[PDB]
């Protein structure tokens, strides 16, 4: 079991890991003395495998920056390197019709566009921590501009019309960051639109499953594309929901949807026989056809870290510190490097590595020390309260 | 010493039933879809449909391989038949009002996707000139060289990192061999001429024994990571389709040197010492590979490695390459053919163990590997002819 004891000893592994391993794997060095933003796209050994920059990737880690000044340490560098990042986005980033790009060279020209807005919610939620930390009000103003272009873009747009959970959970996670930084009065009853919009359409009791897309009505689609599922994510979309039940006292209603969430999703995406959280699975048990449907990836399983701990620590039902602590060893022993710091991204079904980098155009600094800060804050709260 | 005339007479018969009795059956005439026209053939490994939908240019790839089969093995009414009904659904519904190609439609030809490329077309030309040539539809000979006509236009002028790719002139090379041998185009050898000289001033890089997969407009190398990696397969695909043109052109030695040159080359860069088989993707310079499936074992590079090698060894005699050509041969038959239910599975991990069990998506479906079994059981029927 997890007594107070077990639990202040992982605040203390995970604050270790992520400001003695993860944070000085990237920064300072990380950060472009040249042209502004962040060298992310780094080998095994911290070497560079490119000189590109993901514009999502160079919002995250300037939020993280940000965040680690507002919430552990006042240290100057981070809000300096914060400010590199911020500046980057805005004199390079943005595209002449508004729309922000998705890649860019090391000195800010457009590599690659992409038709969704997710590089602008990134933007908010790096402005709004960063309008926090340095009290700059030009920073403050941009986030509360973008976000009600992200609401614009989620809400006013073949013959198979789709829709995805992804639009709801990421605009959801942005609202909760705002509000947790600067606020803004239009972020409580949007919160609540989108965690509706989860459990109207997505959320499927009848068939313990989260669904990826949906049919306009909810229906599933029965197609390779529609039937696939994505464990790592909905447990994503579960723990910010356990995040706003949290943040509205309590909510049983809304920890009984986060904990459906993470039961139907723990038991579909964790690999019984080799450990670890699968990539895709297939609603109907139909063989997954996307070709890493198989492999063990970084993030689902910083995510599903952060949710079982959550569940556990709001529930207190002891099978969450069960899944805590399986998918704890399995991710650490499996994805962390003891020799260079920081964590591999890649593993093959069966665990083994698959290839050695450390960033590339979707790794970075953001789930693995998001995944720290968050369960090292969480429980520096819950053992306050004890 | 390696291969003795009577192991490559028993090779020919192996590939010809295999062909025959295992891979055609596994299709047809069950994918027909009678209702609708065209095929089903998003299958699992026990034949059971997946889905429904049509893949647009699996379902000219397979009008293909069903008038090749035609006009080249038997001339089966069945197949004719089949031919037809893609032929026929691919001019009902897959065709915008721009004249452009979808991608990827519904059982009853409603667009899902369409695609910029013009891919979709080369297999629309490629399905409807060895269709004119089995049925004598002359509308289906004037549509091949009307949209081979377009792709050359396409191909000629086909964003601050501007790239070349090398697919370009190898699917365009590849559709002017089959519109050559089925009904015939004056401008099909001129234009081969153009796209073998692109691969090998562009692509083809001697002094690191590399063949790329997309360069700068002048050549040079992209040192990125997307221009860092390379297709073994992809590759070793364009060095077989060079050597058939070499024997087109009387066994032309320059052609001969090019396409073995780069065999030699991707076969160092891509055959897994530790495992066995063919790696999907590798970078040039040896830094780790980004795309996930970078390390998977897939069906077809290992079935146009099958060809390359052994054509390459017919023209050349030198015996590494039945050497090479019995390493491929045995690995992919051993791994991914199945005995139980026929045809193969395409998708292994890095170790050779079976990463999922379908047989046809999106992506594959009857094309590859008939054409791997097709084409090595006609080339060693030539060739023991001739050594008789
Ligand atoms: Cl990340
Ligand atoms: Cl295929």
Redesign the interface.
């Not at 139909?286 to 056809?289: D, E, N, W, Y």
């Given at each position: 079991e997890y007594t107070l004891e077990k639990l202040k000893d992982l605040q203390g592994f995970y604050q270790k890991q992520l400001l003695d391993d993860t944070v000085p794997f990237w920064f300072p060095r990380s950060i472009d003395r040249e042209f502004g933003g962040y060298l992310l796209?780094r080998?095994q050994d911290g070497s560079l495998?490119?000189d590109?920059k993901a514009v999502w990737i160079q919002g995250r880690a300037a939020w993280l920056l940000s965040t680690l000044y507002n919430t552990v340490e006042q240290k100057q560098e981070w809000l300096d390197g914060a400010k590199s990042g911020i500046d980057f986005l805005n004199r390079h980033c943005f595209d002449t019709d508004g729309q922000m790009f998705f890649h860019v060279?090391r000195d800010g020209?457009?590599?690659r566009k992409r038709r969704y807005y997710f590089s602008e919610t990134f933007a908010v939620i790096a402005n709004a921590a960063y309008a926090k930390a340095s009290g700059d009000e030009a920073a403050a103003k941009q986030a509360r501009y973008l976000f009600g272009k992200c609401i614009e873009y989620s809400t006013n747009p073949?013959?198979?019309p789709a829709k995805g959970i992804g639009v709801p959970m990421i605009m959801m996670n942005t609202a909760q960051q705002l509000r947790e930084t600067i606020g803004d009065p239009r972020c409580d009853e949007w919160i609540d639109k989108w965690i509706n919009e989860i459990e109207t359409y997505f959320v499927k009791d009848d068939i313990r499953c989260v669904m990826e897309q949906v049919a306009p009505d909810g229906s599933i689609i029965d197609?390779?594309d529609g039937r696939t599922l994505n464990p790592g994510h909905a447990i994503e979309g579960a723990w910010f929901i356990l995040h706003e039940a949290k943040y509205r006292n309590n909510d049983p209603r809304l920890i009984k949807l986060g904990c459906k969430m993470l039961d139907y999703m723990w038991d579909r995406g964790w690999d019984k026989e080799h450990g670890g959280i699968l990539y895709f699975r297939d609603v109907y048990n139909?063989?997954?056809?996307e070709?890493?449907?198989?492999?063990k990836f970084w993030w689902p399983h910083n995510e599903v870290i952060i949710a079982t701990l959550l569940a556990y620590t709001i529930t207190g039902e002891e099978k969450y510190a069960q899944w805590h602590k399986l998918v704890h060893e399995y991710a650490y022993q499996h994805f962390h490097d003891a020799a260079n710091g920081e964590w591999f991204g890649?593993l093959?079904?069966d665990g083994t590595l698959?290839?050695?980098?450390k960033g590339?155009?979707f790794k970075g600094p953001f789930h693995l020390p998001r995944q720290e800060w968050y369960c090292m804050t969480l429980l520096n709260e819950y053992l306050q309260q004890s």
């Open positions: 796209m080998d495998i490119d590109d060279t020209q457009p590599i073949g013959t198979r197609h390779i139909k063989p997954v056809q070709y890493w449907q198989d492999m890649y093959h079904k698959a290839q050695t980098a590339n155009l």
